[PDB]
Nucleic acid binder design. Structure first.
Lengths: 97, 92, 106, 171, 127, 197, 69
RNA sequence: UUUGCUCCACACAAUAUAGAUGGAUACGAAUAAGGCGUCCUUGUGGCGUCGCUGAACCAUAGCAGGCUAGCAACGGUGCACUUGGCGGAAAGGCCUUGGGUGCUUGCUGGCGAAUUGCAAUGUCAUUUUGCGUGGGGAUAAAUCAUUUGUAUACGACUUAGA
RNA sequence: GCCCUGAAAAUGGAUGGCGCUCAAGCGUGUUACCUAUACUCUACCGUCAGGGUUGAUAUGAUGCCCUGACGAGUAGGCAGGCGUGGAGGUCAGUGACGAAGCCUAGACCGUAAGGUCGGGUCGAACGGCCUCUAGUGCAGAUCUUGGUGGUAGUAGCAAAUA
RNA sequence: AGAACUGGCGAUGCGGGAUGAACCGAACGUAGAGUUAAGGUGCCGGAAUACACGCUCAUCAGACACCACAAAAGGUGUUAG
RNA sequence: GGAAUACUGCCAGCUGGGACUGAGGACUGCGACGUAAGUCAAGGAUGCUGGCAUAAUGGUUAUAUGCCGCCCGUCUUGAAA
RNA sequence: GAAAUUGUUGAAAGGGAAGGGCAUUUGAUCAGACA
């Protein structure tokens, strides 16, 4: 079957997603992606490596989006994260987009 | 198994069990809970085993209390030992 | 050298058995490279060791050995019947045994 | 088993009213002497009312092929009793010896007409002296001039469970 | 040392437990012949417990010898012990369970003097 | 004789290969079967599809989640054929089955390992010519297995890589053959010839 | 498609022993009912027909030559 | 957290065998056909040769493999480095650059071996955890309780709170 | 002769299963091989039978020695034994330096009934042998009396307004 | 269905027929060794994926008893007469 | 015309390998080889050697594995339920 | 001061029984003997 090969995240993630990664956000130090933002500091060599790996090997590319739930009237502050598949264009075009 | 036919399951469990079993056994042996070797000076092979006598001599040499010496039996052992010492006294 | 072997590798196959009755006192050993009962006549009388390890360091060693001998052939495919002083445990069905070259007729 | 051909010679027990009775001979194919001699007695029962207890066996002698290394076309004549009556048959057997031809025919009767050795009656076996006198195409197909045939798709018997080459069905 | 004997072979080393002595506490382990007409034990089916029969009788040359090679004799006093003075290689005196400690030391003294083997010399002795 | 025997599944008969492998496992030997999708069965395709559907009828009526489980992949069809040849409900049978690994295609690390064949289960040497036969990958695809195209794609890739490997190895054995033939007439070569070498 | 049920080939003990009873009954009834050749056969594809024919026709003299003195 | 945790260099306790003891030694396809070598006009080509099993091939000599002296080649091979490339099916492997230090049984020498007493697997892997041995790197969460009602019999679910 | 059709429903399943197709199917031939409490040989037990034995510087003559054959078993028959309460005799038997009893993966004898010993506990009586006697041996009787479980922290403690 | 006899079971284990009152084998003390019976030798399962001669392809083969039934026939299946 | 070989059978022909057993306990027997004393494989095992000298063998015991394994009793012997 | 039954401790086993037979592994435990 299909297999998740790798996952590359944005440099800056909002609080709304970071809340999704905690059960106890208020107690936390909110350390969610602190060792991962540094992968963008070193000219993005690791980020570029995994994106080239997706280009080389992936036959399905899915993007990860999330809702700006603060814009809704909802009381929930923990945003909703999902995988949305990208259709159209070649694999390299999907990754570049 | 039927979901993971390519993993050993019984064999992995048996390896894990033999490892944990003799790790526990070695833990017991290092704490000395096992009885010593037959040739050891601390062994009692060929000699009578008595909880009461062992506790009496452990209290005289001076804990475990599931093995307990009653004051009744302690007095009986003291009396028997007085008899035995008198016997050795008539011997020497 | 890198090979120090003076024994022929074997496998513990099963006890002597019927369809519904086994007999632990006799054990069936498959010798490597022996494919006919007339080839197996060479190994009759040879000593078999089941060498297995343990955890107690008993008598200066942590490796234990069961001793036995090849008694006769079995079938037509080169299986031999072997008997040990203590019969091999049934957990060893599929375990490697060692058939030494002694006593010799060569 | 593996057959032998016997002659079995017998006669009725002599009497005051008859010294030296007639001697009767049959050529019999059997595995050994005992089966052949019983075979003789069964046939002699059927042919005419001679009881085994009333007669004797004057001789029994194995018959060998005169030329047991010359391939002959054999014409074998058979009656039998399988499975729902009685029949005549005539089988060509290209073969070397009469006993091998007879054993081949017994195997053929067991294979096709499902008949046991006790159900088969060998009536006459004859070396066809002339190849023009052969009547069955399955034997007449090996008599042709300059005969050659391959043995396509050779299967190699392997003494090893595993092989490290895909096997070949060559020559 | 003992009077010479062959190997002491026991034709059935395991005790003959009673049939369902394991299933029920009320059924003791003392052997009992199963008297039921349909007892698979009595009919001697495959895979059931073995029953006593005379085929298991021990060798007559060895039937009452302990592993040391002596027939055990129960002694209660010095007088009983001395009946084994001329039979020291064929009998070993066992001291009865109820002999007191002082009488036991008297028995051991006499036994060592006569060379009679005593089976349980360790006994009630807590010197 | 090997520590692990990697059997190429292609061209083999399911029952005969299963019996061979089962007796190997029960004897203490570790067996890996690769390319389970090119494995063969005797009889026309429709006949074996019908036999599989006959198997596929069986299910616990009151709760189908506990009935027979009809595993569709050719590795699992072979495994089912093999598990019936072992007393798998015992500890010995379970232990022997765990000396077996069966795969579709040839995944790593066995793609770099020697593959063997079992001649007494090879369809070529066993099944009489002209008799119909069934390739297990077709049967599995027909009755549900949904990764035939994937395995075909990866097998084509593996064959490309292995062809490159074999070209290199054949070049090197050409060089070595030239070298051994250039030394094929020396004194030591003739001495080895006297000893059958 | 939808393959139907296949009858079991696993015979029962009851059926099998019933067949034995039926077969014995059939043997006995056949004996009871039974209590209430046109071929010498020299085959027409045997090659030596004429030779053996002539030989046995020569042997028809003995059945009438000798019997009377 | 008497610095808990992790990753690097040694010394041993505990070691572990569903069963190590020279090497799992890699085309694909066909089987009424193919493998290999060579040539050209590069083909469903020509020529030669091979199978008929792996009974093969590679390794393989040394105190379980010691200590030394040379000859001949500049080969093979081990180890720790390092160069570049390839491998995503479960890649965790394969190939390659360079130096460094060993070994070399390709060849010839010198010394040792004993007494394990006529055999007893006679132990020669790593398998890891760890009391410790001295250098690095790292500085969170989860649950209960409170709360929510998109959930709920109770658990569970979904929220919020420095 | 083999093959096909030669009807038969109803949970999902059966040449015992896998599976097998120049069979692992069908008929037959040849061998090799596997295996019962059977057969052969030996040892041990018991029974039965046939011989021998007063010989004493040796014991027990229902004892001993030699030899052979046998060994299923309900009702039932015969025989030999094991165990328990009380009685006569005896061991000038055991016992506060611990009787009896009870507990005990500690030991030994017996084919077995059972018997013996070690340790713990106990605290005042009890055994061996020859006999005598009987309210003499339990797994059951929807057995009797007593005690105790699972069920189970379960059903339930919700009528009569609070 | 009746008669007459003889065997089997009752009271009886053991090997085999996957399984088992009625089948095949089998003189029941405790063992050891050998050899076997009936049945078997692909794997489950001890034992030849033995040798050999043929036949058979079944879109639910057969492995099975048979002077047993459905069974008398039907077939541009194949083989020998 | 001369053999040879196969097949079958015989030898009180020779010679290997493997396994199980070692009962009995002065002598007496029948034998054999011997020139004889004697010796012997002839009315049942002895010789030489090593290791350990104790939990090593062994037992008890908890288990694990292989194969076996109605659940007892009563009454029904017939599904023998 | 038994057993049923129960608590704690120590050991061990457990993938829709438990128990029992033969054999042996492993762990725990344990008796005996001096040319």
């Amino acid at each position: 079957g299909l297999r998740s090969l790798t996952t590359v995240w944005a440099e800056h993630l909002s609080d709304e997603v970071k809340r999704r990664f905690y059960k106890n956000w208020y107690k936390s130090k909110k350390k969610a992606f602190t060792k991962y933002s540094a992968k963008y500091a070193q000219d993005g060599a690791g980020i570029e490596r995994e994106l080239a790996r997706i280009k080389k090997y992936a036959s399905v590319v899915r993007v990860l989006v999330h809702t700006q739930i603060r814009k809704t009237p909802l009381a929930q502050k923990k945003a909703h994260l999902a995988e949305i598949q990208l259709n159209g264009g070649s694999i390299s075009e999907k990754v570049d987009w | 198994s039927k979901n993971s036919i390519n993993r050993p399951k019984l064999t992995s469990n048996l390896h894990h069990k033999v490892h944990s079993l003799n790790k526990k056994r070695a833990q017991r042996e290092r704490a000395g809970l096992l009885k010593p070797a037959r040739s050891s000076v601390n062994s009692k092979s060929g000699e009578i085993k008595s909880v009461a006598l062992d506790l009496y001599f452990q209290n005289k040499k001076n804990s475990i209390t599931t093995r307990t010496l009653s004051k009744k039996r302690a007095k009986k052992i003291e009396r028997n030992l007085k008899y035995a010492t008198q016997r050795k006294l008539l011997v020497d | 050298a890198e090979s120090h072997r003076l024994y022929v590798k074997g496998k513990h196959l099963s006890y002597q058995r019927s369809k519904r009755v086994n007999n632990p006192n006799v054990s069936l050993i498959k010798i490597e490279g022996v494919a006919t009962p007339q080839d197996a006549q060479f190994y009759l009388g040879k000593r078999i060791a089941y060498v297995y390890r343990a955890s107690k360091e008993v008598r200066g060693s942590k490796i234990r050995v069961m001793w036995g001998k090849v008694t006769r052939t079995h079938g037509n495919s080169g299986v031999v019947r072997a008997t040990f002083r203590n019969n091999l445990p049934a957990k060893t069905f599929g375990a490697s045994v060692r058939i030494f070259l002694y006593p010799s007729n060569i | 088993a593996h057959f032998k051909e016997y002659q079995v010679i017998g006669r009725r027990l002599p009497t005051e009213s008859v010294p030296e009775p007639k001697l009767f001979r049959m050529r019999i194919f059997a595995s050994n002497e005992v089966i052949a001699k019983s075979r003789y007695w069964y046939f002699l029962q059927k042919l005419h009312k001679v009881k085994k207890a009333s007669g004797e066996i004057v001789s029994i002698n194995q018959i060998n092929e005169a030329h047991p290394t010359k391939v002959k076309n054999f014409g074998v004549w058979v009656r039998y009793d399988s499975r729902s009556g009685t029949h005549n048959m005539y089988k060509e057997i290209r073969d070397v010896s009469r006993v091998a031809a007879v054993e081949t025919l017994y195997q053929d009767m067991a294979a096709r007409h499902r008949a046991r050795f006790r159900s088969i009656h060998i009536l006459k076996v004859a070396e066809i002296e002339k190849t023009a006198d052969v009547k069955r195409q399955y034997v007449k197909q090996f008599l042709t001039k300059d005969l050659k045939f391959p043995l396509p798709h050779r299967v190699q018997k392997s003494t090893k469970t595993f092989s490290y080459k895909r096997p070949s069905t060559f020559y | 040392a003992s009077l010479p004997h062959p190997k002491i072979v026991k034709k059935h080393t395991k005790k003959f437990k009673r049939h369902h002595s394991d299933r029920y506490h009320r059924v003791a382990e003392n052997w009992r012949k199963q008297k039921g007409i349909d007892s698979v034990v009595r009919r001697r089916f495959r895979g059931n417990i073995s029953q006593p029969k005379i085929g298991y009788g021990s060798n007559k040359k060895t039937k009452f010898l302990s592993p040391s090679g002596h027939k055990t004799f129960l002694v209660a006093n010095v007088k009983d012990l001395e009946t084994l003075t001329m039979h020291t290689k064929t009998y070993a005196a066992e001291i009865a369970h109820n002999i007191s400690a002082k009488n036991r030391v008297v028995i051991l003294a006499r036994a060592k003097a006569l060379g009679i083997k005593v089976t349980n010399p360790k006994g009630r002795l807590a010197l | 004789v090997e520590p692990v025997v990697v059997i190429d599944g292609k061209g083999h008969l399911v029952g005969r290969l299963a019996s061979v492998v089962a007796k190997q496992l029960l004897n203490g030997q570790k067996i890996v079967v690769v390319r389970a999708e090119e494995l063969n069965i005797s009889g026309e395709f429709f006949r074996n599809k019908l036999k599989y559907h006959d198997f596929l009828r069986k299910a616990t009526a009151f709760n189908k989640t506990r009935g027979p489980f009809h595993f569709r992949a050719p590795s699992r069809i072979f495994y089912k054929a093999l598990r019936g040849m072992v007393s798998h409900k015992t500890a010995r049978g379970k232990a022997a089955l765990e000396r077996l690994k069966v795969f579709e295609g040839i995944p790593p690390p066995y793609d770099k390992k020697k593959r063997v064949v079992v001649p007494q289960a090879l369809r070529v040497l066993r099944l009489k010519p002209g008799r119909k036969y069934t390739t297990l990958g077709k049967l599995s695809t027909s009755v549900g297995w949904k990764y035939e195209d994937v395995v075909a794609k990866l097998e084509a890739k593996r064959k490309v890589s292995s062809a490159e490997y074999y070209a290199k190895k054949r070049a090197f054995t050409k060089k070595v053959a030239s070298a051994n033939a250039t030394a094929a007439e020396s004194d030591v070569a003739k001495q080895l010839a006297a000893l059958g070498y | 498609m939808r393959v139907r049920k296949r009858q079991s080939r696993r015979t029962s003990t009851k059926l099998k022993e019933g067949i034995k009873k039926k077969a014995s009954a059939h043997r006995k009834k056949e004996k009871k009912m039974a209590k209430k050749k046109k071929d010498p056969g020299i085959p027409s594809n045997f090659p030596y027909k004429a030779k053996i024919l002539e030989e046995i026709e020569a042997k028809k003299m003995k059945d009438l030559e000798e019997r009377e003195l």
